[model samples]
Target: ISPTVVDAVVIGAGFGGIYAVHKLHNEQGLTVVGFDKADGPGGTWYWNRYPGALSDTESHLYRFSFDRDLLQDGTWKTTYITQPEILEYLESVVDRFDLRRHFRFGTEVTSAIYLEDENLWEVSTDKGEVYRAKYVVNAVGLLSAINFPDLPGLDTFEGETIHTAAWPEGKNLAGKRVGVIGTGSTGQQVITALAPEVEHLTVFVRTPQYSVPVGNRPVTKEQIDAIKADYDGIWDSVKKSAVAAGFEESTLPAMSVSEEERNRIFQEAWDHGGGARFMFGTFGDIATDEAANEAAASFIRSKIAEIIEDPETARKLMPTGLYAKRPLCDNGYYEVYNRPNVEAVAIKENPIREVTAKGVVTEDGVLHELDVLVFATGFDAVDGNYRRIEIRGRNGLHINDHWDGQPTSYLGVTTANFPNWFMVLGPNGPATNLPPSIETQVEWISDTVAYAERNEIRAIEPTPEAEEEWTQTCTDIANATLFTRGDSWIFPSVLFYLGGLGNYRNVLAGVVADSYRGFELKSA
Candidate 1:
């Protein structure tokens, strides 16, 4: 098919893509087309439909803040939003803004070639259709890519095998022998929810995590009224905060407080419900200062030790690592182990030899039989989606070639070799509450596009030197934090802009104010 021409082409119609289309088309006045591999909107939410799935962020703040109307009108029935509620909220945003018309569902843009001579992007889909656009917005999410493990007996599995990312609709696991591999946030949620329902559960854990209670509960009308009354203040505060998780980040040094005071504060946040709240709200240095982190980490370990009934199982559940990586929270994740049907296998100690058709076989020849397998293995994260696509930039420079390892971007928006292409939550981007971060990126990118359009700028890309400088800056900040010690989405060894979203936003603004520093904008 002859390429359908447009001012812009957006990929991944979730929180990012939906906003890209609205802001570019509805606000910036650029004709835009959005695409997603899924059949509809909600991006990651649409796909991750597994039971017990919910947003780690609270309900009131886990939404777009740009629209004042929605912020006032949006009503959440619970403290934390579940998958269905989040998907529904996203869909509501799509419909309310008439954004669904701009999207091409189930049509993933498989390739996006930046044609230098044409000064435009040539985007192609798996459906063999194509489009040429003046700009491209890559909104593929951070945790969207699946990281299904390569096991020896995976192909020979006879029973149902399901990845948590691609859980089948309405699939029931009641009274079934279930084996879940990997124990990240998803695994924790699944194990907690499944323990009461499933016949039995085997949690194949690699690294035990320091998780706090989610403390989720029903939202009251009084709380909603108070939130609505101060919508402006709440958003303003979120914009200034580090994590944007709707809680005041603690500035008090963990050790500054007496043990009685420290334990009291920790207990309050522990009962308050939230990963970020527990990690950032209770103490300032839980993820930074080792002594401070150990204080908090020890507390969580004690809680885990207290919760689990069996001494051995409690020992297996106790986390030995630092209180780093992404702060994790769950509803009775430790308590789930107390159930007779549930079992925790510290896979690091008893490694999985391979998968058998019936179940998982340990290295010591113990075959734990199961009726179903759930790989809660998280995504390749950050730049995995970029690597999956054939995105070629200046002089046939492949994106993979440009990024020798995990990807890096100029302030997490644009890369050096790629011109007129923007990435939301891209590598070296904010390691904070993502929706706020997503909003920050999209707004910055949209404004940049407007600048380029107004000035008749044909090509726009960051200088390699600038990219290097920004990458180094991110590395310096990353190295300062203990999060670097762990290998996960929160800290994938220099893959994120560890600076808080507020600071990141100011940096973006400063760049623009300084005439878009470190960028090479080629005029028409």
Candidate 2:
């Protein structure tokens, strides 16, 4: 432990952490020390070097709106950005703002312990250094930790294995027989990009994903200039839009239209290009209404039927689940299956019995040989990183134990036991556009911190009563939506929901409405 303590410590130097450090340091005049596991900047982007990865959200709405200069100066070359471009943009921000000085790069936080008596947090790192700060804010991203499936013979396989989250930078795969697993956003993108490159590519899929066409085109100078001219209005519109940021508008509600009209709308969106066109902008009630969702889903299946040349392949590509569950946009994903070198095998058809010296063997004794295997499986979302750290509050209350079944926090920022602690984009928080919500929360937290410091406040934290009531408010608002039925990260587990409730949007609003809801900001 070091004698020199700071005002605050930020975890993960990603978009959230970067903004938090900026606001806390610039606005609050508080010394903020931040950490990231990566050697230099771009937390997720730096790590996710996988091919074919791209953002579903438009490039314009995916950035921070806090700094006017950063917003105006930065130019987007595409409707959606690729991983490298996004990483480069963030790097430029760090350079432009000189944010590198405040952060400890290439270090991961192993543990965090809160000392109630001193009202300070003692954070430990793998490097054996200790950081004690008056306040600790988690800017750890929602999708930080990657989840590699527990396969019986992953290690035994002679072929090289790579996770989509951690992709090799410059390995040549000119003529290698590759196996790609998981057809989610990453997997879909990988297949499209690699189809033309690899000699033989086999995609192992569990579910047939509904993907929109990415009629991606180069953004002209005029397009960028127009956005720059009306930047303020665009931001204002972003706040009022349905999901808070991203695309402009939705077509008629899925339930409000005739079958013919719905098809026409779907076709139009398909031609218009991008994932948001199908998932978010095509319909209003697709997420909550099952019947309306089915109409949208059927249209996606029809597209798959038309695109894939082989009848059997087309049938295999068709999906039969809710469209909104995991809809993705693709460049030429389905068309890849029509390629002669490509073969997609369902796990059910060839149950991967075990891994051999050089490949995977199914239960039927058929061997699928490959030089490489890619796991495009996603991460344990928002709350997972918080749980990864050992956080304790009043009376030595462990945060993980408290969140055993369903995690609940006030406005996805505060917990009852934790003092001078806040979680940005935390659990049960607003499921709105993440980047916009992240910026909002960062600004709000910076304001609150500044207010406390200016008033000589010793500490500020939500009370136990406030946490309970706020968690209930979250539960109430989410229950009203169709979000409750699904097993999304949004819901408390059924056991936790039955025992208690937690929803973020309602809770945050309630706290704001009730004058911050029992969260006392005390002065020294």
Candidate 3:
């Protein structure tokens, strides 16, 4: 098939790709074409329309900080934005920027191969359409790759199945016996939402989560006026802060405070209602020191005991492990267990044996009957979406071969041998609230591209030596943290740069100022 020619091919029209198209086409004066499998924008938000889907990050901080006008304009009703609302906001951004014309919605990028001699990237789609472009921008999200579990006899089940990530619009689950698996953030949200509506709710939990209440409340017009007043300063600190979680990262250590004071801080944050605010806002080193983590975990466990009426059920809900895994917060997650209609099925010991015609059968020989099933199983994460595509760089080296099981990136932007290809939120990116980080990476990528264009450079990629050193830095930072002990979707624990957004931002600035150190630019 003859290919469509363009200066750049941007993948995934979500937050990252949407901005990539705008910056490259509008600002950099490059003709850009964008792609997404979904019919519209929002990327992750577009697909994950599960019953109780809400941004773990607060509404005010969750959006794009790069666009100053957009910030003052939003009239979000809640402290935390809901799925539909965020998606709606993203739509407005597209319209406001007039970016929709450049994107080919409902198209999946299947293959991207860099031509060695020509220095052009040939990006192909599942529709059999192809595009030969000088640059390729990957905004294909960290969490878009769905992780559906394979249980024995799942095919034989008569019930309708849905992965919570791909929840179809207007699909009703009312009065049906529903079963959910995977107890991460998505699972917690879905369980809390479905308990009242579904006939019976069965949550197959693997690990117990140390969850604080999601204190979502309506925002006032008065609050909006004051927040808009300091929009510039708000973003200024957010970009400078670690985690960028919309609040100050506390300097006080959990152990430094008396147990009484620690409990008071935890309760205050718990009342404030956000995962990051609880994890990074309350104490500094809950994720670094074992003693600090233990102190925080104990407080959450005690809260569970007080909330759950049944002793045995409370025991199951209580988390004995390190309080690490992304710091989940929910609206009455433990309290949902108090309802007789909701049940938590522990799959750690008595694992799911198989799916029968009626429902799931546990190894203990009891069948939990269900009319509907949901898997909030989460994504493969980080470089998962990239690995799914056939991306080949220099010497026809597959991206999988480059990663070779462990995903690595040079400053989480570019890698060795992949010339002119940039990942806004790739492997080893910031371990923070993503929107700000996305903007940072995109701006850097745009500037890099502009420099290459101005310099008459045909190709630009990081050297292998630089890539190795950056990866080692990630290992050193992650090894010092308690997060390595727990295994969640952030699976390649060693790969993520836990130095926070503030440090990463300064590092990027230094790299740029140093004339793009560690990068090999080929002259045209």
Candidate 4:
């Protein structure tokens, strides 16, 4: 039997995949098919249901802005929505738009092979099905795959083990002694929530994190109604903003103001509470200028010192580095250390030797016993999910070998030699609020597909020259900023460009109008 063929195939039913299916099927009249590893539609939210799983972006802005009615009708109760609320919202979107019927739930796409002769993509699933489509949209998100440490004795442990990415449903650790590893954003959130619940909590920290108070609060009906009244204008502001968070960034330099005024500005934003506001709202040069960034970083360090009671614990918890990594927001993250039951273990001073049947053993031969062990180690990020899949492009060019160490793409959408193949939030894409970025990529790809069908174009691939130019442009733009200064995950700055999200949208729109600049469209 021949494989089932469709006009387009979208993998991973996250924000990107869901919107891609909607646009192709309804707007372009393409017979589209979508698949996800999860049984439901929430992508990252579908999994990662660990304690204190919440969005860093504000609830009102972290959603779909394409549908005005959905934006106005949907209601959020808190400033930062929880995982359950986000999942419910995503499911509601599926039901509202009648998109559930078009997706195969619990089906994972294992591999995709591009047929150059026929100009079609052959995608295979774990369910023993092959889908042939004219176009394949890889929406496998940036943070889908979890990174487990290459530690021994993982199977030797007798107690319950949990990865934040694959947390079980309805599991409780109220009376249990819990040990958490890693102190990234996830670790901070889980530890803050667990400190009050668990009898004793041991936090294994390699490097400390800088976190600001979230200032979370329940939303009033009036607040929702006020935003709904100007929903169109709100979206307009979002489209014009850099990060698409519907907030305005300051144009003043941090050092330009007097010490009293600068301190007041930083204090107000810190009190108001959010990563975006603290970084971008306080000063325009906070991310670009060293002096300005230092002003903000020092303020945060002082706040951390004030929050934690013990000076020794506060010093251990203080983060020392360029504030280049993602700014974290939390609800009483540092304050949790004041709890008598909570303890912070500096793993760098006494690194872990091994994981035993009981718990983790340190290099100093200290064994920390625990009833439950949690690994909050982050995802392999941008290119990790793609590496897991076997993707072959023109002339059997494997994606793994093509981007062995450094991954490059033309505008983070299409790459050289990959025809009729597009990705949302791929390598070298803009670093900003992801939903807007996802929307931009999906809309651009949909428009390109529609153009191909209208003009009888069979394949569209970027030129090698264009890809090289884009990669260099991405590097140059990142070099102009302070994002590449530290030994953080964003060091190379090749994975994501630090250019404002709005700039990326405008550039892509211009590229499309210029007959899809730097691309070759074939009718054969």
What alpha-carbon RMSD in Å does predicted model 2 have with respect to the real structure?
Answer: 3.3
**Which residue window of length 10 is worst by lDDT in model 3?**
486-495
Give the CA lDDT, 0 to 100, for residue 456 in model 4.
Answer: 97
Put down candidate 4 lDDT per residue, 9-99, tens digits, no spaces: 9988889888998999988889999999888898888887989988888888889889877887888888989989988888888888889
Question: How many steric clashes between backbone atoms does each model show?
Answer: 2, 3, 1, 0
TM-score of 4: 0.96
Model 2 TM-score is 0.92
lDDT of 2 by residue, 379-419 (tens): 86666777777788767778888786777776567776677
Model 4 gets an lDDT of: 0.87
Total colliding residue pairs, candidate 4: 0
Model 2, runs deviating above 4 Å: 143-145, 150-153, 490-514
Clashing residue pairs in candidate 2 are: 457-523, 474-503, 475-503
TM-score of each: 0.95, 0.92, 0.96, 0.96
Task: Quote the positional error of residue 324 for candidate 4 in Å.
Answer: 1.3
Kindly report which residue stretches of model 1 are placed more than 4 angstroms away from their true locations once superposed. 143-145, 150-157, 353-357, 361-367, 485-493
Shift in Å, residue 92, candidate 1: 1.4
Residue 87, candidate 1: C-alpha displacement in angstroms:
0.7
Q: Which ten residues in a row have the lowest lDDT in candidate 1?
A: 484-493
